Each structure stands twice: as structure tokens, then as C-alpha cells.
Amino acid sequence: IVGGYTCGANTVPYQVSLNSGYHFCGGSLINSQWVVSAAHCYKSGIQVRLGEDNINVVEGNEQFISASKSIVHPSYNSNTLNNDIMLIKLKSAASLNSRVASISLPTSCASAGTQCLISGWGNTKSSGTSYPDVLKCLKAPILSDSSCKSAYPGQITSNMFCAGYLEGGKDSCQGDSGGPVVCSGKLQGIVSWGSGCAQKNKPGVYTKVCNYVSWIKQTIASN
């Protein structure tokens, strides 16, 4: 997260870190057995780490659970990044408490202008690399579809939205992918792609989760 602030220990209790020997992508806990992340975060050998704040220090509230099944969206296109979403089933149910909680899926999509919270352990610099060990948060609005499309002409589908600041300075970045975008208590986006991080007129592009809720509900009930 570039230009964000330290969230504070377990203030984003639905945030998960996907780990394969090291943090590589975020994800969101949607109920005690299921996590959703970005499809481009797919790997076999994923351990889901819940209750994390410093990902390098065992602070006591963590739960580390292996994934037993990953399901990438049936229409994910790695060339366009259209339908960049996947579901991960945990080997055993997470214990839900104050530090570890699920986020609700949306009943409706959000509109341009809605303020959202984006969080992750990704790169904190627009030029250079500095990885934080504690969770960073960013408050950012959903931008209009024409702002989005003008920044990335011919690259935005109806399953994407932009959020951020066209002036730059504040954005998600590498290491944040698959992480949550929550607006009014609902999971509305998944950190997916962008051009560089926090550059002027290059806002972050997010998977629009409200288009996938019946696929999510149906898939988890049958797996």
C-alpha cells in the first residue's frame, strides 16, 4: 500500500496472508471454511495465515491453516485479467473470534464516489521497494468508469472498477494482490492490477466482486 497508514493489530480481522514459505498475496475470509483471493495468486502448496498483523513475528493471535482445494474462476483470462477471482477451501474451519472474522459478500454493487478500505502487506513505495511487516490500510474512493477507461483504454471490462486517486500518491501495489476492498461493510473488490503503483492517472484496478456472488455461493455449497 503506498501512502496508507498502519492499520493496527487485528483491526482488519478478515484479512488473510497467503504463504508458500513467504507472504505472496492477501485474501479475505468469507466464512469459517473459505477464502477468496485473486486468480493470478494461484499456486499449489498454499498455507492461509489468519489473525496476522506482523507477518514476521508470532504475536499470538494467528491461525495457520493449509488450503485443501483451490478453484479459479471458470472464465479467468490471464491475458486480460478478466474474472480475476478464486476461492480457497481451508483444511479445517478457522475459529472465529474478535481477531479473526469473515467479511460479508455484497447484496448490491457499489457506485462511484463510495469510500472503501484497501489493506495489504505489499510494497510501500511508488518508486523503489520497501515491504512493511505490519498491515497497511488505505482509504480510497471508487472512481467513475470513464476515469477508469480513460486511464486504461481498451483494457477495462464490466468485471473491473478503478479506485484510488488520479493525482497519484496513494494506491495498492505488488504484494497486495488478492486482498480486500471493503466499502460500507461489504467486500466489493479484490486487488488485481494497475500500471506501476501510485502514479498519476494510473489508479488501481480491482475485480468487481458483486458480479460473482451467485458463482461464489453456488461453488462453496457444492465443494
Residues at the binding site for substrate are 171-172, 174-175, 177
Give whole-number Cα distances, 37 to 9, 27, 151, 171, 211, in Å: 21, 4, 24, 18, 15
Residue 77 C-beta: closest distance to Ca ion, Å: 35
Could you tell me which residues come within 8 angstroms of residue 58 by beta carbon, excluding any fewer than 6 positions away?
none
- Catalytic-residue membership of 145: no
Residue 135 C-beta: closest distance to Ca ion, Å: 10
Q: How far apart are CA 77 and CA 58, in angstroms?
A: 37
* Chain positions contacting Ca ion, by CB under 5 A: 52, 54, 59
Among residues 54 and 174, whose Cβ is nearest to Ca ion?
54
Could you tell me which residues come within 8 angstroms of residue 69 by beta carbon, excluding any fewer than 6 positions away?
88, 89, 223
Active-site choice (37, 84, 176, 192): 84
Residue 66 C-beta: closest distance to Ca ion, Å: 17
Q: How far apart are CA 2 and CA 175, in angstroms?
A: 11
Among residues 21 and 153, whose Cβ is nearest to Ca ion?
21
Q: In this structure, are residues 47 and 66 in contact, taking their beta carbons and an 8 Å threshold?
A: yes
Among residues 134 and 213, whose Cβ is nearest to Ca ion?
134
Q: How far apart are CA 174 and CA 4, in angstroms?
A: 14
Q: How far apart are CA 212 and CA 143, in angstroms?
A: 20
- Cell numbers of 137, please? 490500510
Among residues 20 and 201, whose Cβ is nearest to Ca ion?
20
Among residues 9 and 117, whose Cβ is nearest to Ca ion?
9
- Catalytic-residue membership of 23: no
- Cell numbers of 174, please? 505488488
Residue 190 C-beta: closest distance to Ca ion, Å: 23
List, as residue ranges, the binding site for Ca(2+). 52, 54, 57, 62
List, as residue ranges, the binding site. 52, 54, 57, 62, 171-172, 174-175, 177
Residue 132 C-beta: closest distance to Ca ion, Å: 13
- Catalytic-residue membership of 177: yes
Q: What is the DSSP letter of 39?
A: G
Active-site choice (17, 40, 73, 176): 40
Active-site choice (17, 37, 126, 177): 177
- Cell numbers of 161, please? 472498477
For the annotated catalytic residues, the residue numbers are 40, 84, 177
